[PDB]
């Protein structure tokens, strides 16, 4: 049996209980359950017991309840017994265990109150607007899971209350955002940060939940991790708490004047293993060592929370004028805020990584050749050519394309730095706010140098960065860059599932999905969409002991569906033996599993005789009778699910795309925007198959319908080949 409570046994010596804290927790838990009970009785009197209740866009009903006790709450009456249960577990005796049970009851009460609040919520007339999030949908949790698994998001800060001043709120939050922690904000700190023009919203991984009971939208976010990637069953309470403590490195920052309900909520965080750190001074009888502690000095509170939680940060430490971290990757710079730009079809541009010989490379040398961003009035433009020379003993020409990709990400982490595209199609923008802080191309070169030295210590011994901004000179060197681009394109042309004798595992997502195993082949990218076969091969050649390992293609069992003994044995050994077999070219029998970060899901529809596909960003209903989030609840979690499978979007353009099932010809329904994202690949592959370039017009989408009865007549009138193919079954 998991004995999770053992994690608290050292906290309080007997007879020295902090009775002020336990009394405040008791009063706040009773108040929260009472709030929830009256609002529930009123709603049941007004709408009736059977009225549906729930949150927008989640597969997990009321996730806090769904995780800790497993109930599938759907209607108001379902809430009644649960709340009664929770009220019954609030007890006067002042023990640490009773405080934790009161905190769980407070969390249950906040979840109930919020679902009741959402009874009045419609997408057309919502109860919250951006940047505020309220309840955060499943797609955002999944969209940041990939950053969680490799600790690009080292942890999470749940900040409730009010910083002593708005400037202090801005400082601690800018610090956290530069450390890459995911933030949940509640109460007056939000307006404090907005008045300091701190950037907030889901794009910045800094969620303004709202006030008061909206605090629970951090809890139901965190618990979803274990429900989704961890695959833990609903209702396995101690297993969920153990997943939270082990992998959701959250802590609470309790700022400003205390009140009973906030304190009971923080105790609910402690109940699942998240320490609480407050800016208030604390008497002995209102603190718990390593669980409810005071750090009044704002200069130290962040490092205090990080150390008590166990979070370790690895910053490049270079003193750059602008903030840097994952939160800023998703920013975009409006034309009115843009100080200068390069590339994007407005000026010549290229970026290139290139291996060099040892004797004429100067490690750390960052040079800007040509005018700097000093040169232009705001809104102007310059050419940019970036060349990162690299020498290392164990550097390989193979690594050049891989490291080149990093530039995009390295640039977008800078606040006011923006980057898109690649090679000679780059577009880069620098905001007026960054220019006013002193940012110049020098800092871009130093940033790329430090991030390359930090991310590849084993293979980079020397790195040099040159940024050219003369038009003619950029055009001249762009031809050399294009030469290297063509070489890489040819090496990529040579690869195929048959020509290579080694496929590659990837185990990264096992930090959160312990049983999941990805197998990457030249014609099948990993389901995150970011790990191609060349990427896994380079990661293994750089770190032989890492999460990517070679697997020889041996012991063939089924050439058609794509089963080999070697991959079977590897997946069985590395899946904690939940998975014995896997077919690479079909979803209908022994499909590869998923963690929860798949870019899209495929599913077989017998009534259409073919596949639907739905990407994570699509909002609406699909012909199988489920949204992407509901389908993802079944497809993720490391279980084998014949007839369903998660995939990267680019996989749809592979020649091996579910080849044993009929490939692209079997696809009958995709979202319109997904078809348009992939229009060129789909047209080219469809012509290769003999389906015609107009085959994309025969694929149904949501503008055709969202049910089988609406879609089938369109497929029949359009003569879709899948209808005349063999049923998959």
163 or 509: CB nearest ligand SF4: 509
Is residue 528 involved in binding ligand SF4 (CB under 6 A)?
yes
Is residue 531 involved in binding ligand SF4 (CB under 6 A)?
yes
Q: Tell me which residue has tokens 């082949």.
A: 521
Calpha distance 588→592 (Å, rounded):
10
| Minimum separation from the CB atom of position 514 to ligand SF4 (A) | 12
**Number of residues binding to ligand SF4, judged by CB under 6 A:** 10
Contact region with ligand SF4 (CB under 6 A), list: 205-213, 527-535, 558-566, 708-716: 527-535
Q: Of the candidates 205, 232, 518, 612, which one interacts with ligand SF4 according to CB under 6 A?
A: 518
| Minimum separation from the CB atom of position 636 to Ni ion (A) | 6
CB atoms near residue 15 (< 10 Å): 5
288 or 597: CB nearest ligand SF4: 597
Contact (Cβ atoms closer than 8 angstroms) between residue 570 and residue 554 = no
Q: Which string of x and - marks every residue 464-503 that binds Ni ion (by CB under 5 A)?
A: ----------------------------------------
Q: Of the candidates 591, 596, 610, 643, which one interacts with Ni ion according to CB under 5 A?
A: 596
Contact region with ligand SF4 (CB under 6 A), list: 352-360, 466-474, 525-533, 635-643: 525-533
Among the listed residues 250, 284, 263, the one whose alpha carbon sits nearest the alpha carbon of residue 153? 250
Please choose which of ligand SF4, Ni ion, none residue 270 contacts, taking the beta carbon within 5 to 8 angstroms, the exact cut-off set by kind.
none
306 or 531: CB nearest ligand SF4: 531
Q: Of the candidates 265, 474, 527, 584, which one interacts with ligand SF4 according to CB under 6 A?
A: 527
Please choose which of Ni ion, ligand SF4, none residue 386 contacts, taking the beta carbon within 5 to 8 angstroms, the exact cut-off set by kind.
none
68 or 456: CB nearest ligand SF4: 456
Contacting residues for 631 by C-beta, under 8 A, at least 6 apart: 601, 603, 614, 622, 624, 644
- C-alpha distances in angstroms, 431 versus 194, 277, 327, 416, 456? 19, 35, 16, 5, 29
Is residue 508 involved in binding ligand SF4 (CB under 6 A)?
yes
- C-alpha distances in angstroms, 714 versus 607, 672, 703? 13, 15, 11
Please choose which of Ni ion, ligand SF4, none residue 234 contacts, taking the beta carbon within 5 to 8 angstroms, the exact cut-off set by kind.
none
Contact region with Ni ion (CB under 5 A), list: 28-36, 152-160, 437-445, 505-513: 505-513
Calpha distance 570→577 (Å, rounded):
10
Is residue 206 involved in binding ligand SF4 (CB under 6 A)?
no
Please choose which of Ni ion, ligand SF4, none residue 506 contacts, taking the beta carbon within 5 to 8 angstroms, the exact cut-off set by kind.
ligand SF4
Cis ω for the linkage preceding 201 (within 30 of 0): no
φ, ψ for residue 520, nearest 5 deg = -105, 130
| Minimum separation from the CB atom of position 183 to ligand SF4 (A) | 24
228 or 306: CB nearest Ni ion: 228
| Minimum separation from the CB atom of position 549 to ligand SF4 (A) | 12
Contact (Cβ atoms closer than 8 angstroms) between residue 288 and residue 401 = no
| Minimum separation from the CB atom of position 59 to ligand SF4 (A) | 19
| Minimum separation from the CB atom of position 446 to Ni ion (A) | 32
SS3 of 330-395:
CCCCCCCCEEEEEECCCCCEEEEEEECCHHHCCCCCEEEECCCHHHCCCCEECCEEEEEEEECCCC
Is residue 526 involved in binding ligand SF4 (CB under 6 A)?
yes
Calpha distance 31→106 (Å, rounded):
9
| Minimum separation from the CB atom of position 513 to ligand SF4 (A) | 8
Q: Of the candidates 218, 506, 582, 665, which one interacts with ligand SF4 according to CB under 6 A?
A: 506
Among the listed residues 515, 318, 336, 524, the one whose alpha carbon sits nearest the alpha carbon of residue 431? 336
342 or 504: CB nearest ligand SF4: 504
Is residue 522 involved in binding ligand SF4 (CB under 6 A)?
no
Breaks in the chain after residues, C-to-N cutoff 2.5 Å: none
Please choose which of Ni ion, ligand SF4, none residue 28 contacts, taking the beta carbon within 5 to 8 angstroms, the exact cut-off set by kind.
none
160 or 601: CB nearest ligand SF4: 601
- Residues numbered 586-645 forming contacts with ligand SF4, rule: CB under 6 A: 595, 597
Among the listed residues 428, 410, 423, 360, the one whose alpha carbon sits nearest the alpha carbon of residue 390? 360
Is residue 509 involved in binding Ni ion (CB under 5 A)?
yes
| Minimum separation from the CB atom of position 500 to ligand SF4 (A) | 17
- Residues numbered 218-277 forming contacts with Ni ion, rule: CB under 5 A: none
Calpha distance 577→563 (Å, rounded):
17
| Pairing mode, strands 380-381 and 338-343 | parallel
Calpha distance 137→322 (Å, rounded):
31
Contact (Cβ atoms closer than 8 angstroms) between residue 520 and residue 536 = yes
Q: Of the candidates 509, 678, 682, 712, which one interacts with ligand SF4 according to CB under 6 A?
A: 509
The tokens of 612 are what? 């639907």
**Number of residues binding to Ni ion, judged by CB under 5 A:** 4
Scored b (16 or more CB within 10 A) or e, 659-693 reads bbbbbbbbbbbbbeebbebbeeebbebbeebebee
- Determine if residue 186 is labeled as part of a ligand binding site: no
Please choose which of Ni ion, ligand SF4, none residue 596 contacts, taking the beta carbon within 5 to 8 angstroms, the exact cut-off set by kind.
Ni ion
Calpha distance 385→478 (Å, rounded):
7
- Determine if residue 509 is labeled as part of a ligand binding site: yes
| Minimum separation from the CB atom of position 414 to ligand SF4 (A) | 24
Contact region with ligand SF4 (CB under 6 A), list: 189-197, 409-417, 501-509, 694-702: 501-509
- Determine if residue 518 is labeled as part of a ligand binding site: yes
Please choose which of ligand SF4, Ni ion, none residue 715 contacts, taking the beta carbon within 5 to 8 angstroms, the exact cut-off set by kind.
none
The tokens of 54 are what? 């729930």
Among the listed residues 690, 704, 601, 581, the one whose alpha carbon sits nearest the alpha carbon of residue 651? 601
Among the listed residues 171, 261, 177, the one whose alpha carbon sits nearest the alpha carbon of residue 216? 261
Give the CB-nearest residue to ligand SF4. Answer: 526
φ, ψ for residue 368, nearest 5 deg = -110, 115
Contact (Cβ atoms closer than 8 angstroms) between residue 247 and residue 146 = no
CB atoms near residue 296 (< 10 Å): 12
Burial class (CB in 10 A: 0-12, 13-18, 19+), 399: buried
Enumerate binding residues for ligand SF4 (CB under 6 A).
506, 508-509, 518, 526-528, 531, 595, 597
Residue numbers in the known binding site for Zn(2+) are 509, 595, 597
Q: Which residues are annotated as a binding site for [4Fe-4S] cluster?
A: 506, 509, 518, 528
Known binding positions:
506, 509, 518, 528, 595, 597
Positions touching Ni ion (CB under 5 A) are: 509, 595-597
């Amino acid at each position: 049996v998991i004995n999770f409570d053992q994690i608290f046994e050292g906290a309080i010596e007997p007879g020295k209980e902090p009775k002020r804290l336990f009394k405040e927790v008791y009063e706040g838990a009773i108040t929260a359950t009472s709030y929830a009970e009256i609002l529930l009785s009123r709603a049941i009197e007004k709408y009736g017991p059977d009225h549906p209740v729930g949150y927008p866009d989640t597969a997990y009903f009321l996730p806090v309840i769904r995780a800790f006790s497993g109930e599938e709450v759907r209607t108001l009456k379902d809430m009644v017994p649960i709340l009664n249960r929770m009220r019954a577990q609030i007890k006067s005796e002042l023990t640490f265990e009773n405080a934790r049970l009161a905190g769980e009851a407070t969390w249950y009460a906040a979840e109930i109150i919020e679902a009741l609040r959402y009874l009045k919520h419609t997408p057309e007339n919502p109860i919250v607007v951006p940047p505020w999030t309220g309840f955060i949908g499943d797609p955002v949790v999944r969209q940041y899971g990939i950053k969680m698994v490799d600790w690009t998001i080292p942890g999470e800060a749940i900040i409730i209350g009010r910083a002593k001043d708005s400037k202090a709120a801005k400082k601690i939050v800018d610090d956290l955002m530069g450390k890459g922690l995911m933030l949940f904000l509640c109460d007056e700190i939000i307006e404090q940060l907005l008045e300091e023009n701190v950037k907030l919203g889901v794009d910045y991984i800094a969620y303004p939940l709202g006030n008061f009971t909206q605090v629970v939208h951090a809890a139901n976010y965190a618990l979803r991790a274990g429900l989704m990637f961890g695959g833990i069953a609903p209702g396995l309470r101690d297993a969920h708490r153990d997943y939270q403590r082990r992998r959701v490195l959250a802590f609470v920052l309790y700022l400003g004047e205390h009140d009973m309900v906030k304190t009971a909520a923080a105790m609910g965080a402690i109940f699942t293993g998240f320490p609480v750190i407050t800016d208030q001074p604390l008497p002995e009888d209102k603190q718990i060592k390593d669980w409810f502690i005071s750090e009044p000095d704002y200069d130290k509170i962040v490092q205090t929370a990080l150390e008590v939680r166990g979070i370790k940060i690895t910053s490049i430490d270079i003193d750059l004028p602008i903030n840097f971290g994952p939160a800023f990757e998703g920013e975009s710079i409006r034309k009115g805020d843009m100080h200068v730009e390069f590339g994007g079809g407005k000026t010549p541009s290229f970026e290139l990584v290139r291996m060099v010989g040892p004797d004429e490379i100067e490690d750390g040398k960052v040079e800007v050749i040509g005018p700097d961003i000093d040169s232009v009035e705001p809104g102007g433009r310059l050419p940019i050519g970036i060349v990162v020379d690299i020498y290392g003993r164990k550097m390989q020409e193979d690594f050049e394309p891989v490291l080149e990709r990093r530039i995009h990400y390295f640039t977008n982490y800078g606040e006011g730095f923006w980057h898109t595209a690649q090679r000679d199609l780059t577009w880069v923008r620098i905001s007026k706010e960054a220019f006013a802080k002193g940012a110049r191309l020098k800092h871009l070169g130093q940033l790329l140098y430090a991030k390359f030295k930090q991310e590849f210590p084993s293979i980079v011994d020397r790195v040099q960065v040159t940024i050219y901004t003369d038009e003619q000179k950029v055009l001249e060197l762009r031809e050399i860059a294009r030469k290297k681009y063509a070489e890489r394109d040819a090496r990529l042309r040579e690869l195929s599932d048959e020509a290579v004798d080694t496929y590659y595992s990837c185990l990264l997502c096992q930090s959160f999905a312990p049983t999941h195993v990805c197998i990457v082949s030249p014609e099948r990218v990993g389901l995150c969409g970011a790990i191609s076969w060349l990427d896994a091969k380079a990661a293994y050649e750089i770190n032989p002991n890492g999460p990517n390992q070679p697997i020889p293609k041996e012991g063939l069992i089924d050439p058609v569906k794509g089963q080999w003994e070697s991959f079977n044995e590897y997946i069985y050994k590395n899946s904690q033996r939940t998975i014995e077999r896997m077919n690479l070219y079909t979803i209908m029998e022994y499909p590869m599993t998923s963690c929860g970060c798949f870019e899209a899901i495929m599913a077989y529809l017998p009534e259409l005789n073919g596949f639907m596909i739905v990407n994570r960003e699509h909002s609406g209903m699909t012909p199988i009778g489920m949204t992407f989030s509901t389908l993802a609840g079944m497809v993720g979690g490391g279980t084998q699910t014949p007839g369903f499978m998660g995939i990267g979007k680019s996989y749809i353009g592979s020649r091996k795309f579910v080849k044993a099932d009929g490939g692209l010809a079997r696809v009958v329904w995709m979202p319109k925007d997904l078809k348009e994202q992939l229009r060129s690949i789909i047209e080219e592959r469809a012509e290769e198959e003999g389906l015609g370039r107009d085959f994309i017009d025969k694929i149904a989408d949501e503008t055709v319908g969202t049910t089988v009865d609406e879609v089938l007549p369109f497929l029949e009138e359009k003569g879709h080949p899948a209808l005349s193919m063999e049923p998959l079954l």
